[PDB]
Structures are given as structure tokens and as C-alpha cells.
Amino acid sequence: FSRLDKVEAEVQIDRLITGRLQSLQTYVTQQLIRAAEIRASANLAATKM
Amino acid sequence: RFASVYAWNRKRISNCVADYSVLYNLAPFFTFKCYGVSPTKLNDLCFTN
Fold this sequence. Notes:
This is part of a larger assembly, with 2 copies of chain A.
Chain A (H helix, E strand, L loop, with lengths): L5 H43 L1
């Protein structure tokens, strides 16, 4: 925003927003898998108790 | 005098304040396009060489 005109900076800014945003989406998906695996372990632990 | 194509002259600029408005004054500068920066934002940037 300090070097490029607003007519063209939209293209530059757009290709970077999606990339950062897409990286967050991957991280959330990984947590869901890990949470699912832990939930299975907890049920096994509860049965043991 | 301007030198030939194969003998382009290289010039040094250092330690001075640059105003690009005086560049815009001359009429026949009908070919003025820049890649790395927007032409209208040259008045609030600093360079090293």
C-alpha cells in the first residue's frame, strides 16, 4: 500500500490473502483429526476405570 | 549531448533530496510507465542507490 497503485495492488494483495487464509484452514483440519483420535482414547480409558 | 546506444553513460546520484514533479513538467514525456513502484508515489520513498 506504500509502493503500488490501487488499480493493480488488488491483484497483488489478493494472491497473498488467500495463501495465508488457506494455511489456517489446513491447521484447523489437522486439529479435528487429532481431537477425534484423543476422543477414542478417552472412551477406552473410561471403560478401564 | 547523449551518447550512442552501445556507449550508454552511467551517472551517480548520492546524498540529495529528489523531487519528481519537475520531471513531470516537460510535455513530451508521453512514455512514462514504471514496474516496481507506482509513478505517483515517488515523492514519499527513500532509496539506497
